[PDB]
Copies of this chain bind each other. A is one copy, B any other.
Amino acid sequence: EQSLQLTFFFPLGIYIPTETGFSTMETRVKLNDTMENNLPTSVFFHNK
């Protein structure tokens, strides 16, 4: 009974360029037009 150590990495605040931007899954979500939704500032992810 031995332990692993898996290391994870994830970004926040990466500005995707609008100049070549796009979107798939337009049918699934639709944001409300606010610049806090139009720029990533935070990152949400699940816990254990």
| Chain A contacts to B: CB under 8 angstroms | 18-24, 26-32, 34, 36-37
Contact = CB atoms under 8 A, between A and B. Distances in A.
Contact of A22 (B21, B26, B31): B31
- Chain A facing B: main interface SS: loop
Given A18-B34, A21-B37, A26-B29, 13 more contacts: A18-B32, A19-B32, A19-B34, A20-B32, A20-B34, A20-B37, A22-B29, A22-B37, A23-B30, A23-B32, A24-B28, A26-B27, A26-B28
Contact of A26 (B23, B30, B34, B36): B30
Contacts of A31: 21-22
A24 B20 contact: no
